[PDB]
Amino acid sequence: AKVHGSLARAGKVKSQTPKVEKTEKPKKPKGRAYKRLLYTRRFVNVTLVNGKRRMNPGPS
Amino acid sequence: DKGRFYAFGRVFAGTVKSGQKVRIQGPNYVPGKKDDLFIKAIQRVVLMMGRFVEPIDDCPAGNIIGLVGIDQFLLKTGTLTTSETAHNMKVMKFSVSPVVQVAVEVKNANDLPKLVEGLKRLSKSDPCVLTYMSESGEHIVAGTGELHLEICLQDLEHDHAGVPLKISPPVVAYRETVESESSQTALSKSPNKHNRIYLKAEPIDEEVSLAIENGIINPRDDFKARARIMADDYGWDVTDARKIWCFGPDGNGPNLVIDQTKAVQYLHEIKDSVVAAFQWATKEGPIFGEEMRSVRVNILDVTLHADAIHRGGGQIIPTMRRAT
Amino acid sequence: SVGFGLVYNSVAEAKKFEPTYRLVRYGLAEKVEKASRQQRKQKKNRDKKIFGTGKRLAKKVARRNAD
């Protein structure tokens, strides 16, 4: 329909976004060493059970 | 052969290699940044012979040479250093710069785009020849001298685009604007007789209109902080300074629409209609559909019929344009 | 270490059946060699144009060079 759309605003977002780098995050295990990390906290250390069951939450 | 072209440059230091890693320090590239940087791999090297060449794999400092393959990555003319800490060389001089100017089209418009790659081909055929677009849908061609451009036109002619071309002087555009202020308050309502609009236009200071085109006044700045900058430095009304409504056209134009009503409880309901219709207006002006520059609007008193059903985009936009 | 040995009745029957590469890999005979295959194939066809020894043709070219 409208062919001659204005394109002087395109890219607005990925332009003035607060440039926040990636904080110092320690290396995590890759491969088999990973299932180790997952399994030890996903089952061995477990999480909550408010009602039925949960996983990744938020700050409250 | 095949459509590839070996670069032409002099070695200032170092010995060239067939597949050497070097960094391109483009005309805007600077060591402390990353813009115009291109650390690529040459395919091989070649030594000149008048019109033909022969594959020389190495060459020393001070002796001029040819670096083939890096064509599709450079920026026409640039520095090639494998040393990152290296500053940017001196950026030529020439002393000529674009002055000649024409317009190009076709006698057969169905293959018109083949003519445009002929234009990009000319850039990739000469040094100081500069091809660009006009603010009126034409492909302005500029250069050194009249014959220069004509030989470059004979190039675009037979070779590059290789098709029928129409040449005319560069068709200009003269920014429609105002000398005085709106004599009286202009009145206009919907084709569906009801809701009216009242305004008057005045000459904006290029000091600030140029401040638009230099990052001082942005259509999305601090109505509070930018108010201090236009009241203390530009002597405007800090009242409507925070009341600015839109930058027409393209959403950043040298023209602005300003709030000044008092008893209109429903003004914000038609703003979108106003800002976009104000664009269609500053786009094609009455005189001869020419964009506006340093053109301001003082929206005085605007009455809107009861419910927003008749006070809607479908009929307000036609009123605003006519009121402006 | 699964290898594969060969005990010949005599050393004579060795340089008879035993393929070159093995016995040469040892150091029985001297490193026998000719030009590379690219030199050999190219040299092969050049000699395929010339008929017979025809050294009078190489002498015939020693004629175009004096005439």
């Binding site: 088999r32 060493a33 299932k35 180790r36 399994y39 030890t40 089952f43 | - | -």
Partner: protein, 185 residues
């Protein structure tokens, strides 16, 4: 022009992508059998199915038939020579039964951990890979070697690497030269 090196896939992903139930049991398997790729568990079920399948097809045929006997018996007696199938159950019906846990309970990894050796289950994997343990002396760095029982008593640090003789480690020799370099003459 040579000849076909007949390829074929050993595993088989599920007709479903994210079925809650199915994912919870298999992660607990990578903690009980210290695996890392579902492909490693899939691979099991695939071979498990091919088995279960031919078993079924043969299971349908008229009993006493040469096939149900040949293909059948010979088969059963193999899953057994690998110690997966129970000796008691020799009517290919425990095979139809079974479960990944059983076929996976006979891997070099599970036995390397159960036969003590590398203490923890995973620490067992850390060694198999770091060249250790062997068959009749045929060292292996394949944590999924499939212990078949007739090789279960031969499981032990192969003649290579410490804990089985040979020359210990290069860090130990460096520690010896680092010990005599610090204090000595």
């Amino acid at each position: 022009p040579r000849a076909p090196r007949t390829y074929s896939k050993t595993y088989s992903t599920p007709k479903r992508p994210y079925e809650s139930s199915r994912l919870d049991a298999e992660l607990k398997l990578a903690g009980e059998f210290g695996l890392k790729n579902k492909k490693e568990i899939y691979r099991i079920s695939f071979q498990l199915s091919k088995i279960r399948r031919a078993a079924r097809d043969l299971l349908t045929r008229d009993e006493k038939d040469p096939k149900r006997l040949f293909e059948g018996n010979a088969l059963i007696r193999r899953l057994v020579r690998v110690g997966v199938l129970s000796e008691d159950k020799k009517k290919l019906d425990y095979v139809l039964a079974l479960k990944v846990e059983d076929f996976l309970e006979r891997r070099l990894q599970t036995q390397v951990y159960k036969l003590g050796l590398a203490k923890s289950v995973h620490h067992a994997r850390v060694l198999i890979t770091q060249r250790h343990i062997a068959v009749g002396k045929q060292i292996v760095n394949i944590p999924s070697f499939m212990v078949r029982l007739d090789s279960e008593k031969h499981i032990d640090f192969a003649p290579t690497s410490p804990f089985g003789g040979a020359r210990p480690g290069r860090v130990a020799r460096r520690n010896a030269a680092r010990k005599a370099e610090a204090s000595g003459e």
